[PDB]
Amino acid sequence: GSSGSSGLSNGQGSRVLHVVQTLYPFSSVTEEELNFEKGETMEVIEKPENDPEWWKCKNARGQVGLVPKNYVVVLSDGPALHPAHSGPSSG
């Protein structure tokens, strides 16, 4: 079963607002909600007004949905836009 790819792309009015990480694993059944695991990196594409407790992000699967902010956390602001290194974290 050979696999292949053409190169489909979309055009939405949104960009990488802020990079957030998932502290706890949250998996939904519907498409509305996002699906990820513990220790997943995403990017805030849009934030809903009506539901401020929820944020719009895109997982690795390239799918967007409503993810609970109380579960994620903002690490940096912008895709390597501001001058800031990971940290003195021991290697």
XYZ file of C-alpha atoms in Angstrom:
91
model
C 0.000 0.000 0.000
C 2.099 2.877 -1.316
C 1.283 6.346 0.015
C 1.300 9.651 -1.845
C 0.479 13.347 -1.567
C -0.468 16.059 -4.059
C -0.233 19.255 -2.034
C -3.615 20.596 -0.949
C -3.655 23.953 0.840
C -6.235 26.310 2.343
C -6.564 30.059 2.815
C -7.925 31.241 6.155
C -7.694 34.670 7.757
C -5.584 33.733 10.770
C -1.972 33.363 11.905
C 0.180 32.197 14.817
C -0.941 34.471 17.653
C 0.776 32.742 20.574
C 2.377 29.331 21.099
C 0.765 27.368 23.930
C 1.385 23.928 25.426
C -0.985 21.280 26.781
C -0.477 20.386 30.443
C -3.181 17.714 30.568
C -4.404 15.294 27.867
C -7.753 16.326 26.388
C -9.501 14.260 23.714
C -12.962 14.984 22.313
C -15.353 13.020 20.100
C -16.723 15.856 17.970
C -14.814 17.966 15.447
C -15.769 21.208 17.193
C -13.373 20.423 20.041
C -9.649 19.848 19.521
C -7.906 16.514 20.085
C -4.454 16.234 21.658
C -2.423 14.541 24.393
C -0.252 15.461 27.378
C 2.657 17.631 26.279
C 1.372 18.858 22.924
C 2.412 22.113 21.253
C -0.148 24.200 19.368
C -0.662 27.713 18.001
C -3.466 30.174 18.751
C -5.088 31.023 15.419
C -8.193 32.757 16.770
C -9.993 33.463 20.045
C -13.803 33.303 20.366
C -15.537 36.187 22.139
C -18.745 34.475 23.255
C -16.740 31.619 24.769
C -13.645 33.254 26.318
C -12.964 30.104 28.338
C -12.206 28.370 25.040
C -9.488 29.107 22.483
C -9.094 28.237 18.801
C -5.875 26.365 18.024
C -4.537 23.917 15.439
C -2.994 20.565 16.367
C -0.380 18.605 14.419
C -3.168 17.068 12.337
C -3.756 20.599 11.085
C -7.262 20.557 12.543
C -8.785 23.517 14.382
C -11.216 23.405 17.288
C -12.231 24.739 20.695
C -9.566 23.976 23.299
C -9.794 24.823 27.024
C -7.263 27.478 28.030
C -7.343 26.228 31.622
C -5.648 23.148 30.170
C -3.029 24.947 28.079
C -0.566 27.765 28.750
C 1.046 30.590 26.778
C 4.790 30.063 26.375
C 5.889 32.710 23.874
C 4.249 35.506 21.885
C 4.719 35.182 18.137
C 6.680 32.704 15.990
C 10.226 33.562 17.063
C 9.473 37.275 16.726
C 10.658 38.544 20.111
C 14.279 38.123 21.280
C 14.099 35.318 23.841
C 15.959 32.017 24.178
C 14.430 28.821 25.565
C 16.215 29.415 28.858
C 19.181 28.497 31.082
C 17.570 25.069 31.434
C 20.279 22.495 32.143
C 21.188 20.279 29.204
